[PDB]
């Protein structure tokens, strides 16, 4: 006598509130004993029709396997259409109860959640990451044959399978939906080719939403683009441009060489460093103060400061806030990125670092860096499961240096000539826009037709609760600046995010 393994019930995956994101539904599998089927050949065409198979090819198969002990007829029928075949009473055919995954939210959380293969085994996303947790231990039942090789059902020897454990994600489904809508809208409005949006609780390190475009339906995956399956927020890296200037500025303030009211001469909006040149886009002034360097996004201005304080001070801050650093999440295919070191930093590499080039980070890392800045310089570890206690973070930027930079970032949103489209009705919002040329397809240089539109920020400025990053690849029909393309998305999603968490408005009306 032999065994057939009976599969375990895979553990439920939910959002932070209990909304189901991946549930295992019962499905029927039918197998047969050819030694018995060959005695009821008259019933084969009826059976084959009930299985939706060709009557001849079905017969061909049962014939070739006549001497065999055990064969599958079909895997993964519904419980209704499955027991339809059982009701035909055909001798030699039996049922097994199996499980198949279903994803209620579909493409909205597909990238995060991932999916299981045909055998209900985790293969992408959280399904793969927490596969041990979610799987459980399968059982088994013994099949009992008699004197003539017929199997009997009246008696059953069974070891019950142990069901998998429930997993509550950090993601808020209500907030994911909102984030997914707006990123899709922005991507279609601007004719963009890809995008990512990350929402994080700055206090708990929880990822409240993480969505990407293009996406896919994990319930129907026939013919699928590899590009559509990428969780770009964790799997793809980019040079973050001027969105890392507040960290350069943090290093400046902490060095004791600079104060907010210092002025810097940025004339004529260019700075030649040997065989290469630094350029300011808005060459509208000769002199800017520190806040003005962020507002007008002066690459020349921040470069001069970097020469004064040195790259070592800048590199440390960026490293402490998590840029180019392991997140500790353990997501499948997740990228650490690259924050380089040189022993002795030349001026060119010192400058480009100061305004966010030469380093590569993920959206989740950028959002994590802004969360520390938002949480009074107190970096807290990332989590994609529901957090039951506010964890021990690390004070990476000084509480005072943080408040200053918080104030400065609030100005780039609210001050004149600032990123006014990032403003949130009823809330004081802080953040920084960015526009960056994409790196050349396998060459030293950069593209000049392809841009990445960035906006990173947090709100409310009076007591930051959540931080957000928006990234849009290759906008192509309605401008391309970050404060034009990414900022409106930030504004839209942040507005909804805050009210959904019942955050009190601090900027009336
Ligand atoms: C090391 C070599 N290398 C890499 C490429 N490279 C870059 O791509 N630079 C970018 C660049 O500075 N963008 C700025 C930024 O980051 O914030 C500003 N963003 C804005 C925004 O609203 O968000 C604006 C206000 C306008 S501008 C830029 C320049 C020209 C453009 O036609 C568009 C964007 C460099 O500078 C550079 O030297």
TrEMBL record:
SUPFAM superfamilies: beta-lactamase/transpeptidase-like, Penicillin binding protein dimerisation domain. Residues 195-494 form the Penicillin-binding protein transpeptidase domain. One of its GO terms (biological process) is cell wall organization. Keywords: Carboxypeptidase, Cell cycle, Cell division, Cell inner membrane, Cell membrane, Cell shape, Cell wall biogenesis/degradation, Glycosyltransferase, Hydrolase, Membrane, Peptidoglycan synthesis, Protease, Septation, Transferase, Transmembrane, Transmembrane helix. Pfam families: PBP_dimer, Transpeptidase. Belongs to the transpeptidase family. FtsI subfamily. This is Peptidoglycan D,D-transpeptidase FtsI. It comes from Pseudomonas aeruginosa.
């Amino acid at each position: 006598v032999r065994h057939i393994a009976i599969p375990a019930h895979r553990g439920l995956i939910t959002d932070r509130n209990g909304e189901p994101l991946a549930v295992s539904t019962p499905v029927t599998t039918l197998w047969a004993n050819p030694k018995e089927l060959m005695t009821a050949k008259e019933r084969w065409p009826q059976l084959a029709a009930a299985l939706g198979q060709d009557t001849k090819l079905f017969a061909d198969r049962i014939e070739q396997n006549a001497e065999r002990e055990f064969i599958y007829l079909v895997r993964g029928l519904t419980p209704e259409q499955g027991e339809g075949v059982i009701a035909l009473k055909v001798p030699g055919v039996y049922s097994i109860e199996e499980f198949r995954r279903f994803y209620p939210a579909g493409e909205v959380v597909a990238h995060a959640v991932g999916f299981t293969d045909v055998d209900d085994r985790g293969r992408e996303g959280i399904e793969l990451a927490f596969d041990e947790w979610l799987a459980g231990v399968p059982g088994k039942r013994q099949v009992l044959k008699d004197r003539r090789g017929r199997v009997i059902k009246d008696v059953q020897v069974t070891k019950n399978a142990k069901p998998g454990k429930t997993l509550a994600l950090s993601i808020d489904l209500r907030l994911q939906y909102l984030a997914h809508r707006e990123l899709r809208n922005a991507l279609l409005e601007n004719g963009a080719k890809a995008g990512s949006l990350v929402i994080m609780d700055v206090k708990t390190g929880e990822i409240l939403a993480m969505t990407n475009q293009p996406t896919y339906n994990p319930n129907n995956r026939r013919n699928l683009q590899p590009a559509a399956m990428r969780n770009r927020a964790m799997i793809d890296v980019f040079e973050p441009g001027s969105t890392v200037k507040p960290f350069s500025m943090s290093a400046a303030l902490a060095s004791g060489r600079w104060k907010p009211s210092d002025i810097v001469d940025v004339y004529p909006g260019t700075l030649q460093i040997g065989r290469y040149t630094i350029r300011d886009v808005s060459r509208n002034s000769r002199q800017l103060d520190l806040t003005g360097i962020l507002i007008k996004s002066s690459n020349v201005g921040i470069s001069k400061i970097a020469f004064d304080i040195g790259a070592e001070s800048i590199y440390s801050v960026m490293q402490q806030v998590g840029l180019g650093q392991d997140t500790g999440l353990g997501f499948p295919g997740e990228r650490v990125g690259n924050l380089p070191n040189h022993r002795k930093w030349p001026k060119a590499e010192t400058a480009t670092l100061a305004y966010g080039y030469g380093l590569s980070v993920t959206a989740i890392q950028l959002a994590h860096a802004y969360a520390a800045l938002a949480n009074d310089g107190k970096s807290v570890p990332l989590s994609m499961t529901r957090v039951d206690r506010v964890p021990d973070g690390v004070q990476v930027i000084s509480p005072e240096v943080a408040s200053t930079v918080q104030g400065m970032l609030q100005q780039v949103v609210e001050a004149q000539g600032g990123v006014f489209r990032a403003q949130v009705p009823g809330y004081h919002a802080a953040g920084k826009s960015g526009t960056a040329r994409k790196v050349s397809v396998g060459t030293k240089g950069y593209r000049e037709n392809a841009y990445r539109s960035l906006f990173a920020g947090f709100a409310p400025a009076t007591d930051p609760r959540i931080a957000m990053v928006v990234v849009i690849d290759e906008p192509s029909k309605a401008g391309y600046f970050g404060g034009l393309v990414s900022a409106p998305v930030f504004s839209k999603v942040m507005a909804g995010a805050l009210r959904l968490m019942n955050v009190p408005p601090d900027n009336l009306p």
